[PDB]
Design an enzyme around this catalytic site. Structure first.
Site, PDB file in Angstrom:
ATOM      1  NE  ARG A 117       2.601  11.632 -23.646  1.00  0.00           N
ATOM      2  CZ  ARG A 117       2.900  11.406 -24.920  1.00  0.00           C
ATOM      3  NH1 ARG A 117       3.700  12.220 -25.593  1.00  0.00           N
ATOM      4  NH2 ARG A 117       2.387  10.349 -25.532  1.00  0.00           N
ATOM      5  CG  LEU A 171       2.096  12.413 -34.197  1.00  0.00           C
ATOM      6  CD1 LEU A 171       2.068  13.869 -34.569  1.00  0.00           C
ATOM      7  CD2 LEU A 171       3.362  12.092 -33.446  1.00  0.00           C
ATOM      8  CG  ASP A 172       0.353   8.334 -28.656  1.00  0.00           C
ATOM      9  OD1 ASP A 172      -0.129   7.500 -29.451  1.00  0.00           O
ATOM     10  OD2 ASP A 172       1.388   8.117 -27.991  1.00  0.00           O
ATOM     11  CB  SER A 173      -4.898  11.766 -27.255  1.00  0.00           C
ATOM     12  OG  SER A 173      -4.418  10.635 -26.567  1.00  0.00           O
ATOM     13  CG  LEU A 174      -1.489  13.504 -24.085  1.00  0.00           C
ATOM     14  CD1 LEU A 174      -0.829  12.918 -22.863  1.00  0.00           C
ATOM     15  CD2 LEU A 174      -2.473  14.571 -23.659  1.00  0.00           C
TER      16      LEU A 174
END
Ligand SMILES: CCCCCCCCCCCCCCCCCC(=O)OC[C@H](COP(=O)(O)OCCN)OC(=O)CCCCCCCCCCCCCCCCC
Ligand SMILES: CCCCCCCCCCCC(=O)OC[C@H](COP(=O)(O)OCC[N+](C)(C)C)OC(=O)CCCCCCCCCCC
Ligand SMILES: CCCCCCCCCCCC(=O)OC[C@H](COP(=O)(O)OCC[N+](C)(C)C)OC(=O)CCCCCCCCCCC
Lengths: 88, 246, 164, 125, 86, 108, 83, 243, 47, 53
Positions: free
Chosen positions: F43, A43-46
């Site tokens: 996003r 999973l990414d940083s968001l």
């Protein structure tokens, strides 16, 4: 009337379902209590932020930044949600 | 006086209904942005709250009609020339009550879910001590206006014997002078604006979610009670405390 | 041995004061049921008086003792139930009845039901006093005391700063 | 931020600390304080006007700065009453005269004595 | 019960306290109902003589005589009614 | 200043900004579908700018998002009822089970 | 005529008519209100008497409308005479 | 207790006994200055109370405004005003020592401090005291069925009869009393119990005896003030200068 | 063209499935309408 | 039997709440129909009290 009680197994079920229905996970059967969000689940940083928001929405909570950033393991999220008396 | 008596019944019913709704959610939340689709889960609460909201929207047969339409008509029937504007003010508040009741009904019962899933698993109607009052007050908010009409609003009733000056009595003129447009615009306006708010919220919800800064600032003033609690607290109470310290 | 007006005035006072005197001895169960029952009886009495007033419309008066008679200022504890008053009382008694029966289920699992029901009936009593007075002084008595009761009822959850 | 009433008391503080007041309502509620309700830790210095900046003080409102709030408030009131006044010139004429009453305007039944008609007499007939 | 927590048992209020429901409340409720019914009966019976209707208590002949005496007084003192000074 | 584009401080800052934007979107938008649309768009706007390298343009962009969050504030935010700004927060607090401390040699 | 006989002041006082209703049409308000007292003011009771009084008052309203007709015509006459 | 109850009332008695019967013409020329001073004493002292941090000091300031209302009443040249000033004196002599007991013999004897910042949430461990505080507060601010209201009402009646403008402006006493009394009551009785205070006993039988005597008296003279007239129906006409 | 897919759609799907469709979110509205229509028809037939 | 992301089942509302819902709604709509039937001219403005011009 409001005959409902939360348990650690129930929190774990709801969180692993929440992560299973997230498309940006690596794939299933990486999701366990010992799983890391960055390394194992990829999973990414968001997406971690999206997961924490989903946990807020699920258990009826409000997770501040100093308690949001320090959630990096699934067991950590379970511990946190079980350490809040208003976890629904 | 008559509207006071009717308002008591159907407003107490509204608040009782809201209490049952608040207790149907596991976390006893009061925000309509977090209720969703509680119609099939709370049907009795729904029929009671919509009875009360229709007897507050002044729909025919109910107590709101008999108790509220006559005031909007007496605005026109008054011998004073200047009271015609109050017709339109009252009319707009009526077509706004239609709005801020249909909003409640949609966001609470008709809309798509906004809560988590456990809320709907544990959503339930409450016990007899809550429902029986709601039943009785719904019966009142259906029938009491038609019962007490000729006592309070009738022609020459003499029951409440307030000595009105003969120069100021405008009821006989109010019921007769009123033409079709000024008699039907409140009711038709209600029955149209309700449908429109429901239809927009269900099919064209972008109308209420545009994310415009100039619409949002106006919403924010109207969401902060017409910045009325900021003016009082700052410019009266806080300056009073400062002058008191001085 | 039947007074509509005097029963109407005194039964809510009982429902207010007897919990405060005897709450630790009675408990919230009996207090809830008793306060409810007394307001129900007051409501039925008011309905009967309303029927009789539509029939006749000769209001009953109740002229009790003297508050102040100094210099041109004669104030007595006088009460009356006329048309306007009996309408306001229909509203008051009916909504207090239904709210009393409603708060048995609502406020269950609250530790302080006795005080809550005492204060609801306090408000009922002082509003009856407000509407039934035959002078502005009794009205003001009811006025100020319903303000007091509103303060206490809004402050019921004393641990909540915003409620205070 | 120090306000007028705060930096007016500078010549009088002496050895007391000159503390920058920040209301407790706006302090972070999710931190842990010794008094969580008052949002204060034990040995925390208090401003000279702490009575005004504590949790029991009147509420602050963060969304609108106060001068803009006054603009909007008094603007709403002026819009309302000005439109109310303007709309009086656009009023239709009435369709019927006021009611009228038989015995010379009911001056006797309203408390007249044949010289008090102008005071107590109602409309003509 | 449900939703309950600990509380100090040595706190004593004239009201209940925390979930007051003693195990004698039927006897005490009998006593309280007796005292209440008795007080209500006493107040009603004792306030019967202090009740009256609004109308039919004073003959209109008395009213006529009182208003006539008022007129007698008013013209003895040389007074005119309201509005007549015009 | 020196807002490093790939440090932990920037991570905290931008994650906080993303949380704030999503909560504002939840609070402003009543419908669920439009809220999800706006969250996906936000996003997208963050992923477009996740590649920045120059600390000057970075600081400009951060200031820009601060201004956007201040511009789209909500006056009546959604908070759960048991949490600090909530309807149920300090409702029935369990009392601290303390013992009586005496103050007089003669008075109970 | 359409209007009933005007009550005398003494019978207006005997029946205790409120002054707002002491008009030309008060002779039909008396039986209505006694019927209302008899039937406890319920709405299913005094239809005929209420309709009679209401139509009498409608006649008065039509009369006053014709008065304002005459007033408007007179003012327009004065206007075009003033030019 | 002695001071607030009796020594402050010696001045009222001194007006009525030394200054009105003698010096009638000087009084009837000077009383607008009295009204200036009394209105100032009311409003500025109440507002000054709103920014005090000591409890007994708050009650002390509260005495001054009610004595100013009593001065409005006694310097009114109206029988109702004299009777109101006397009832104010008596009822304040009942109620203010009860408040002084609460803030100087109950709380001060338990904690030996009077700063408001330490006190919060007495209702949890000290509920009887909270009931007493609420009763005596709403009595001090002039709730009906207490002699405080009767006296305030009649003193302001007299002040309005003598000078309608000053006597009417003085009726903001009814508000400011409520502000400075309830801002204290709300904090003491309200909230979570203070972390600076340990638990102590509730009120004793002695303290309750005193407060109950002082509450019964004011409720008697508020429910039937007329019982004091048999010793005052001469005094309400002996000091009135009207030709 | 301005089109993007939700990575939470499988979580948000239940908000439009059974007992939450556009049908089921309006079936309970006007609960006793048909009974009232029938009874009022009978009433008017009983005139 | 809790589907934490799945299609939630139909609610198990009691019979007394289903019967009391259809009784109030039926009473409401019947009362509305009857009052409209016996008062449509007054509420619609069909009686014209003005004179014939
Ligand atoms: C400056 C000198 C004044 C001298 C003359 C007297 C003027 C009136 C009195 C004002 C004096 C200052 C009062 C300061 C007291 C503040 C004490 C306090 O701390 O209580 C705060 C309380 C509100 O608490 P809050 O922050 O709102 O919490 C809300 C969350 N539930 O706050 C309150 O309860 C407020 C109570 C006071 C209410 C005053 C209302 C005045 C509004 C006037 C509107 C105009 C209406 C038209 C009148 C026509 C007159 C001809
Ligand atoms: C607080 C209360 C303030 C109300 C202000 C609104 C008044 C209004 O909207 O009505 C306006 C009234 C109208 O008065 P008019 O006699 O009918 O003259 C009507 C004929 N004009 C319009 C030519 C004067 O103007 C006032 O009399 C006070 C302003
Ligand atoms: C008119 C002349 C006076 C009438 C007689 C009034 C005194 C009777 C005894 C009351 C006992 C009581 O109220 O207890 C005091 C209650 C106790 O609360 P609790 O329910 O027992 O739960 C206990 C839970 N604590 C301990 C956490 C609170 O403390 C309070 O919350 C403060 C509010 C005071 C209520 C005042 C009652 C209404 C009187 C107001 C008249 C001006």
């Amino acid at each position: 009337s409001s005959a409902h009680v939360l348990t650690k197994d129930m929190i774990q079920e709801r969180i692993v379902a929440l992560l299973e229905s997230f498309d940006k996970v690596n794939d299933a059967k990486n999701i366990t209590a010992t799983a890391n969000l960055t390394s194992d689940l990829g999973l990414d940083s968001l997406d971690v932020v999206e997961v924490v928001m989903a946990i807020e929405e699920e258990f009826g909570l409000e997770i501040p930044d100093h308690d949001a950033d320090e959630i990096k393991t699934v067991q950590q999220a379970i511990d946190y949600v079980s350490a809040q008396p208003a976890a629904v | 006086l008559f509207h006071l008596l009717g308002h008591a019944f159907f407003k107490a019913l509204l608040f009782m209904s809201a209490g049952s709704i608040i207790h149907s959610i596991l976390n006893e939340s009061q925000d309509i942005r977090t209720y969703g689709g509680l119609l099939s889960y709370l049907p009795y609460t729904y029929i009671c709250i919509t009875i009360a909201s229709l007897s507050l929207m002044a729909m025919p047969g109910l107590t709101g009609y008999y108790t509220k339409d006559i005031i909007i008509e007496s605005t026109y029937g008054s011998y004073s020339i200047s009271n015609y504007v109050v017709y339109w003010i009252a009319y707009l508040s009526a077509v706004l009550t239609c709005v801020y009741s249909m909003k409640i009904l949609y966001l609470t019962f008709y809309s798509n879910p906004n809560n988590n899933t456990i809320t709907y698993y544990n959503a339930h109607e409450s016990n007899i001590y809550i429902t029986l009052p709601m039943f009785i007050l719904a019966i009142f908010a259906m029938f009491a206006g038609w019962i007490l009409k000729d006592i309070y609003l009738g022609v020459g009733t003499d029951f409440v014997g307030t000595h009105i000056l003969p120069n100021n009595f405008s009821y006989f003129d109010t019921e007769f002078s009123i033409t079709q447009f000024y008699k039907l615009l409140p009711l038709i306006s209600a029955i149209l604006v309700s449908i429109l708010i429901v239809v927009l919220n269900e099919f064209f919800a972008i109308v209420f979610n545009l994310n415009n800064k100039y619409i949002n600032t106006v919403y924010s003033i109207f969401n902060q009670k017409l910045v009325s609690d900021q003016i009082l607290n700052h410019f009266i109470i806080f300056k009073g405390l400062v002058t008191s310290g001085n | 041995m039947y007074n509509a007006i005097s029963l109407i005035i005194i039964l809510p006072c009982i429902s207010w004061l007897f919990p405060l005197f005897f709450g630790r001895q009675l408990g919230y169960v009996f207090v809830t049921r008793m306060t409810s029952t007394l307001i129900i009886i007051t409501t039925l009495i008011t309905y009967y008086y309303f029927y009789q007033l539509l029939g006749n419309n000769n209001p009953i008066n109740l002229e009790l003792f003297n508050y102040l008679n100094i210099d041109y200022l004669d104030i007595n504890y006088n009460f009356e139930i006329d048309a306007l008053t009996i309408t306001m009382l229909l509203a008051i008694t009916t909504i207090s009845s239904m709210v009393h029966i409603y708060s048995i289920g609502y406020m269950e699992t609250d530790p302080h039901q006795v005080r809550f029901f005492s204060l609801l009936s306090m408000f009922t009593f002082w509003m009856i006093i407000l509407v039934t007075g035959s002078n502005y002084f009794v009205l003001f008595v009811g006025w100020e005391f319903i303000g007091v009761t509103s303060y206490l009822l809004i402050s019921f959850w004393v641990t909540r700063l915003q409620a205070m | 931020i120090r306000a007028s009433f705060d930096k007016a008391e500078e010549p009088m503080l002496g050895d007391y600390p000159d503390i920058d007041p920040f209301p407790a309502q706006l302090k972070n509620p999710y931190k842990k304080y010794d008094d969580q309700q008052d949002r204060r830790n034990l040995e925390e210095p208090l401003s000279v006007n702490d009575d005004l900046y504590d949790m029991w003080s009147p509420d602050r409102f963060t969304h609108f700065k106060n001068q803009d709030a006054l603009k909007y408030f008094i603007g709403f009131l002026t819009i309302f009453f000005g439109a109310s006044y303007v709309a009086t010139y656009f009023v239709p004429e009435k369709a019927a005269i006021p009611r009228e009453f038989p015995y010379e305007g009911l001056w006797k039944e309203s408390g007249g004595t044949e010289k008090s008609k102008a005071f107590f007499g109602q409309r003509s007939e | 019960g449900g939703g309950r927590y600990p509380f100090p048992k040595d706190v004593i209020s004239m009201t209940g306290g925390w979930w007051a429901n003693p195990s004698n409340w039927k006897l005490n409720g009998l006593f309280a109902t007796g005292i209440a019914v008795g007080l209500a009966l006493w107040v009603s019976t004792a306030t019967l003589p202090y009740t009256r209707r609004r109308e039919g208590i004073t003959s209109e002949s008395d009213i006529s005589k009182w208003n006539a005496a008022a007129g007698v007084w008013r013209e003895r003192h040389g007074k005119i009614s309201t509005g007549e000074a015009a | 200043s020196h807002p490093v584009p790939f440090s932990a401080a920037n991570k905290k800052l931008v994650t906080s900004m993303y949380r704030q934007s999503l909560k504002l979107a939840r609070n402003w938008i009543s419908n669920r579908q439009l809220f999800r649309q706006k969250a996906v768009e936000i996003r997208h706007k963050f992923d477009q700018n996740a590649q920045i390298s120059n600390p000057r343009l970075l600081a400009r962009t951060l200031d820009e998002t601060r201004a956007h969050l201040y511009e789209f504030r909500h006056p009546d935010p959604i908070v759960p009822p048991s949490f600090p700004g909530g309807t149920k927060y300090e409702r029935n607090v369990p009392p601290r089970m303390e013992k009586i401390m005496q103050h007089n040699l003669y008075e109970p | 005529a359409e209007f009933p006989p005007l009550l005398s002041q003494e019978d207006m006082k005997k029946h205790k008519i409120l002054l707002a209703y002491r008009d030309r049409c008060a002779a039909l308000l008396v039986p209505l209100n006694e019927c209302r007292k008899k039937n406890y003011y319920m709405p299913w009771a005094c239809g005929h008497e209420r309709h009679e009084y209401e139509m009498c008052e409608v006649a008065d309203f039509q009369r006053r409308v014709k008065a304002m007709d005459k007033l408007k015509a007179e003012k327009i006459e004065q206007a075009k005479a003033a030019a | 207790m002695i001071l607030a109850g009796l020594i402050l009332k010696l001045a009222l008695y001194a007006i009525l006994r030394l200054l009105l019967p003698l010096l009638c013409e000087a009084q009837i020329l000077y009383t607008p200055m009295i009204y200036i001073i009394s209105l100032l004493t009311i409003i500025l002292t109440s507002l000054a109370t709103l920014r005090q941090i000591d409890l007994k000091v708050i009650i002390a300031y509260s005495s001054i405004s009610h004595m100013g209302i009593a001065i409005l009443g006694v310097c009114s040249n109206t029988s109702l005003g004299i009777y109101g000033s006397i009832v104010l004196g008596v009822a304040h002599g009942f109620v203010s020592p009860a408040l002084f007991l609460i803030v100087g013999g109950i709380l001060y004897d338990r904690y030996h401090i009077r700063i408001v910042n330490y006190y919060k949430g007495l209702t949890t461990y000290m509920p009887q005291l909270a009931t007493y505080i609420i009763i005596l507060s709403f009595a001090n601010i002039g709730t009906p069925l207490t002699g405080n209201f009767t006296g305030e009402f009649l003193s302001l009646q007299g002040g309005f009869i003598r000078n309608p403008i000053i006597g009417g402006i003085s009726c903001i006493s009814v508000l400011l009393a409520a502000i400075y009394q309830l801002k204290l009551t709300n904090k003491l009785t309200g909230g979570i119990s203070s972390i600076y205070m340990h638990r102590t006993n509730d009120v004793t039988i002695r303290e309750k005896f005193i407060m109950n005597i002082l509450i019964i008296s004011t409720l008697i003279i508020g429910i039937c003030p007329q019982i004091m007239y048999n010793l005052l129906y001469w005094t309400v006409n002996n000091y009135i200068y009207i030709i | 063209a301005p089109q993007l897919k939700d990575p939470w759609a499988r979580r948000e799907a239940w908000r439009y499935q059974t007992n939450f469709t556009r049908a089921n979110r309006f079936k309970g509205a006007a609960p006793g309408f048909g009974i009232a229509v029938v009874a009022f028809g009978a009433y008017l037939a009983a005139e | 039997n809790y589907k934490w992301n799945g299609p939630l089942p139909r609610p198990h509302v009691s019979a007394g709440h289903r019967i009391a819902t259809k009784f109030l709604g039926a009473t409401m709509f019947f009362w509305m129909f009857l009052r409209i039937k016996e008062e449509y001219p007054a509420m619609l403005g069909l009686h014209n009290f003005y004179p014939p011009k």
